[PDB]
Amino acid sequence: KVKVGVNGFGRIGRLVTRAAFNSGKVDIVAINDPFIDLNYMVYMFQYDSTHGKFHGTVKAENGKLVINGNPITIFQERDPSKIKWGDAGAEYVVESTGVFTTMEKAGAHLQGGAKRVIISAPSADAPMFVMGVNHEKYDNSLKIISNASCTTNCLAPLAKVIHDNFGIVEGLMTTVHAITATQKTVDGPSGKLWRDGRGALQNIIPASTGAAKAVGKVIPELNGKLTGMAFRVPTANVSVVDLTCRLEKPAKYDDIKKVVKQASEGPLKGILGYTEHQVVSSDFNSDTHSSTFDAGAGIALNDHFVKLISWYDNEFGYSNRVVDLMAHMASKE
Amino acid sequence: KVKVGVNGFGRIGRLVTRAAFNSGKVDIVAINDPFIDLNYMVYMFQYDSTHGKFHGTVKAENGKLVINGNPITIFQERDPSKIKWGDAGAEYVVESTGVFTTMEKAGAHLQGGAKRVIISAPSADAPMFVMGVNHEKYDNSLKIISNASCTTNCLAPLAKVIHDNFGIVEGLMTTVHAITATQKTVDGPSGKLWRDGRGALQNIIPASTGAAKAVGKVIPELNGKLTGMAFRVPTANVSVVDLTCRLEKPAKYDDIKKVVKQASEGPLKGILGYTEHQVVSSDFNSDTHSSTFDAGAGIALNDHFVKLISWYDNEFGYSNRVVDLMAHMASKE
Amino acid sequence: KVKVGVNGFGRIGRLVTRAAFNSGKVDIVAINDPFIDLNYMVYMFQYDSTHGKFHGTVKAENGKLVINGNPITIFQERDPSKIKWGDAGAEYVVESTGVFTTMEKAGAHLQGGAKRVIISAPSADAPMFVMGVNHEKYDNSLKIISNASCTTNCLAPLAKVIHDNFGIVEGLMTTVHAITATQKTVDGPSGKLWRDGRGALQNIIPASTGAAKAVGKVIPELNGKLTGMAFRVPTANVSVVDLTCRLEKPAKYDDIKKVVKQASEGPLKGILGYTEHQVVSSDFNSDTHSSTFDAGAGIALNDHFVKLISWYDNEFGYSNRVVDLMAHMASKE
Amino acid sequence: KVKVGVNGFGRIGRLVTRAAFNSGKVDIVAINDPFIDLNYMVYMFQYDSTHGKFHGTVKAENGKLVINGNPITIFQERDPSKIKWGDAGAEYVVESTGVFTTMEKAGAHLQGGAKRVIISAPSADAPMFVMGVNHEKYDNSLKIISNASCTTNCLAPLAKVIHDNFGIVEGLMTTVHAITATQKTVDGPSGKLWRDGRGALQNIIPASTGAAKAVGKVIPELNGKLTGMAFRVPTANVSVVDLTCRLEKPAKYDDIKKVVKQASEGPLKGILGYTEHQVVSSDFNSDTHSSTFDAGAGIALNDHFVKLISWYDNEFGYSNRVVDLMAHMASKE
C-alpha cells in the first residue's frame, strides 16, 4: 500500500480522506491543518451535510485521529517546509489547501520528506494528469503532479471518447456549477470577482472557467479548440457540464450514445458512466463517477453540430479520482 | 385606450395586470378566474414574493376588484364560451391559463365578444408575434395572436441583431431557467415528464425547450438553425439564455458587443438591453427588459464561434411585453 | 411475518415501503396507486432526492414490482372498496393517500379484505397509537388504527419522559417544519390556507398544527395542556420541535438531560434518541429515530420554566414507526 | 441636519446609508472601509440582492462617492484612531464593522473627532438605547451609545406593550433567523461555534441569542425574565420572533391583539406594526418596521399562557432604526 498525507482539511481534504478509507486504495497516515484542532477534525469528518454521515468510527485518542481503527498523525503547521512529512512516513502528500499550487510551493512538502506531491487544484507549471485520459503518460521521474479540476475531470473523459470517435473541430462548454465555499451566503466583498461576492442563495453567478482550456492541455489534439463559462447556482453538491461542439465527421445522436456507452462499459469504467434514465442532479450525489453522460438531455441540431450533457458530483467524484491517481502512481513505481 | 380582459389569475395573469396598471398602456376591465374568489384575488395581487408588494390600492367593493381606483369586473366561468366578454366591454382578452392554446379554444373567448384573443403561451396554430422582432408583420385581419414564450421572447431580439449583423449558420441554446409552478417542492408524480416531478429545491432539472424552434418561426431565415435545452435550477425569478452559435461572417467579440449596444440604444429599446456591469440574476429582478445582454459572461473561441449570454426576468419581462403587444395592436387598428 | 398492502405511492407510501424492505419487519405484498403506472413506480422508488437512492433492485416484470427479489402486486383503483385487498393476501393495509382518514373511508379497505387498516395521517375518529407512548394500549379488537402525525410522533416520546419525571403544568410547541408537497414552488392558489399557497423557496410560512393537541389524546394526563404552531421553512427533509413548558416540579437542565438520556438508552430506544454533539438538521437526515433530543440547543430560564429541543426526520422516522406499529400489532395478534 | 460618518461598508453599513439617503433624516458625509475600494463601493451600494437596486445615482468622481448628488468622503483606515473623522466634519459616527463593540474601541472614533459614536452591534459596556422603548432616557452627556441588535430591536417594542398592559412573569423566545454573512455556504471551519460552520443552504442551525437578555437591560422590570434561542434557516432577508410568555394578569388573545393595535397606531408607530393579513416572510421584505406583530400566527393556551409572533426585516428595519436613533440624539442636543 501507499501511505498518503493530506494537507488541509478543507472540503477536498476531508473527502479525499473519506474516499481513501472507503475505497481502501490508499492509507492516510497523516493530516495537517494549520487552523483546525483535532477535536474539531473529528466533528468535521464525522458529519457532512452534502455527503451524509461518515460510516465507521472517527475518534481522537492521544493526538491521533483514529479513523476505522487506523491512527492518523495530526500536524498544525502553516508553512509546508515546517511539516514533518518524512517523520510521518508519508510517501505521497496531497496539497488541497489550494494556496500552494505553484510547483515551488509544492516542493516545500517535498523537503518535508514526501516523495511526491499531488495538487488537487489545477496548476499551470505542474503537469496535469487527469485519470483515464492521460494517466498512462505518467512517469516515475515526475515528483509533482496535478489532478486538474473537478470540471476538467468531468469534461476530458467525454472529450476523449467523442474526439477520437467523430472528431471535434471546435467546442464550447457551459457548466451549471454547484455552490462553493468561495460564494458568500449574502452579498459580500470579494475583491477579485465582484460576481462571486454576490450571495449564492438568491443569485445565479456567471463565472469564468479555465477547465476547457485545461482539457486542451491534457488532450493535446484538442488544445485551442475548447473554452468555456460557468454558472454558479444554489445547488449544494452536483453540477452539470454541457459541451456544444461541431464534429469533424458526421454523427447521429444514437451513434454518439453508443460510443459513450461502449467506453463506459470498457476502458473508461468508473471514470466515465452512461445513464439513459430520467436522472436529476440528486441522483448523482455521492457518486464515484468523475463524469456521467446523460443521454436524454443532449440535443443535436445536425449530425455535425451536437450538444452533450454530463453530470459530475464535483466534491466526491474528484476526490475519488485523486485516490485513484495515487494508486496508479504507486503501481508505476 | 384599449380595454383588456384577463383569463386566469395565474402567475402570468397576475403580472400581466400589474404591468398594465403600472405601465398604464392598457386598462384592465375584466378578470376571470374559475377557482379564485374575489377576496383571494385581492390577496394574491397585493402580495407577490418574487416581485415585491403591489404599489397602489387593491380593494374588493361590490364584486369589483378596484385596483388604483379602477373597478375590474370579476367572472367565475370555467369554459370561455360562457364568459360574458362582450358584456364586460373588453376589446382584447389575454388567455393566460394556458390550457386554451389552440386557436379553437381561443375562439371561445371570441364568441364571448372579445374582438381579439392573445395567447400568453406558445401556440402552434396561432401566429406568434414577439415584440420587437416580427411585431410589424401584424395585420388587422388576424384575431388570434400568440406572444410566444418568455424564453423565446428573450432569445429572438438577440438573435435578430446578431443574425442580421454577422449571420448565424447554426445555433444551440442552453437556458438556466428559474423555478416554475410546474416543478413540485419535493419529489412528486408528474406523469408527462418524470424529470419535472422531481423536487425543485434540491435538484437541477434538465428539460426540453421549444423556444429556439419558435424563434425559427418568428424569424424566418433562422428557422431550422436553432434548437435547445433548459435546466431548471432553484432560483425564484430570473433566468439566463445562452446561445452558442457559429457566425457566417467573422466577428470580434467587441464588434458583437457594439452592435448589440447600438441596437439596445436604438430600435430594440426596452425590448433589448445591454449591460457591461458585473451583474447577477438578482439585479435583473423586476425588469421590463425582455432580453438583457451581458457582455462580460460570453466567451468566443473564434471570430466565427461565439457564446452569447442574455438574462431575462421570465415572469415580469414577458408580462410587460404582452401589454406592449396589445398597445401595438390597438395602434394598428 | 405480516403481509402489508400500501395505499398510495406518495411520499409516505414510498418511504413506508422502503423502510419495510430495509428493516425487514413487514413484507409488502401489494401497492395501489390510482394514477402512478408500474414503470413510473420503479422510477419513483429507485430515486429519492431527500433519501438517496434505494439500495437493492427494483424491477418491473409481469405487472409486478419486484423489490429485493420480492414481487409486489400492483393495483390501479381509485375507490378502496374496489381494491382486491383480500385477493392480494394482505393482512394489514396502510392508508397513506390521506384523503381517507375517517374511519368509514378506512373501512372500504376492510371490505377489500384487509384484516386491519392503518392510517398514516392523524384521524379524529380512529384511535391513535403513537409507538413507544401508548402502543401497549392496543388490543386485538380494534381494526382501524392511526399512527398520528410526524410532528406528534416526535413530540410525544419527549413529552412522555418529561411529564412523568418532572410534570408539565402547561406547554407550547413551535415546530420549524420542512417543506411539504402541499407548499407550492412559487406563489400559487391554495384556497384553504392562503398562507401555504405562498411559495416555499422564498417564504417562511406560519401554519397551525394540531400535533400538540394530538399528544394530549395519546397521553391522557397531558390533554388540554399542549397546543402549538409551525413554521414552514425551505429545508427539504428534517424539522425541529420546540417545547416550551413550565414544569410542576423543579428541574435543573442537567437533570432533564439525564432523564432523557436514561430513557433513550432504556425503554424509549429507537423511538427516542439523545445527542450531545453539535448537531444540525442534515445530521438527522435518513434517521430512524422518530424523536431525537438535542441537549445543547434548549435553554431553561428557571428550574420550572424550560425549553426543550427535539429534531425529527419527518419523512423517514415516521415511516419507520409505521412499520414498527404493524409489527407490534402482529405480535399482539 | 446632522452629518453622519459610517465605519464599515458591510451589510449594516451599506443599508444604514441607504436608509439615510432615502429617509433623508441624516446626511452621510463620510464612509470608511479598510478593504473596499471606491469603485467597488459604487457596485456594492448600487446592487443589493436582498433589497433591490438602489434608486438614485451612485457615482465615483474625484475620490468621492456621489450618492443622490451628495459627495461622500471615503477613508481607507484599519484603525479608528487613524481615521480623520473631524476633518470629514462628521458629528456622529456609526460603528458597523462590529469588531469595535467595546467602548474603548469605540472611543478611537471619538479621537478622530466624532462627537458621538453609535454601535450597530450589541455592546455590553455601552448603554443600549433601542428606539421606541428606552430612547427617551438618552441624555446629552453620553457619547457612546449602542442600538442593540436586530433581534432585540424587534422583541422590545412588543415586550414593552405586553408587559405594561398585562404583565409578564416569565418569557422564552424562539427566533427563526435569516441567513447571515457568518454562515458559510457549505460546511466550513468556524472555530467558535461548530454549529455555524455547517452550511446555511442545507441545514437548520440552532444558535444562542442574547437578545432576550438585552431586552432585560433596555426594559428594567423585565430583566431576568427573558432568555432565548435562534434557528438559522435558509431565508435571505426576513426573520420571525416568537415570545412564549406567561402573563401576570389574565388576557384574552383578542385583548392582546387590541393593545398591540392601539400601540401601533399611537406611540409605537413605525417602531411597531400590527397586521391581521395572512402575511408571509416575503411580505415583510424591505420593511421600515423594526417589529411587526402578526395576529393570526400566535396561539394562546390559556389567558395566562400566550404565544406572540412578530416578524422583523432584520437587515432593513434595524438600519432604519439606527438612522432614527441619531435623529433623536440630534434633537436632544
Author numbering:
A (entry chain P), B (entry chain O), C (entry chain R), D (entry chain Q): 3 to 335
Pull text from the paper.
Here we report the use of “Build and Retrieve” to define the composition of a raw human brain microsomal lysate. From this sample, we simultaneously identify and solve cryo-EM structures of five different brain enzymes whose functions affect neurotransmitter recycling, iron metabolism, glycolysis, axonal development, energy homeostasis, and retinoic acid biosynthesis. Collectively, the BaR approach was then used to reveal enzyme identities and solve cryo-EM structures of these brain enzymes with resolutions ranging between 2.69 and 3.40 Å. These enzymes were identified as glutamine synthetase (GS), ferritin (FT), dihydropyrimidinase-related protein 2 (DPYSL2), glyceraldehyde 3-phosphate dehydrogenase (GAPDH), and retinaldehyde dehydrogenase 1 (ALDH1A1). Interestingly, malfunction of these important proteins has been directly linked to several neurodegenerative disorders, such as Alzheimer’s, Huntington’s, and Parkinson’s diseases.
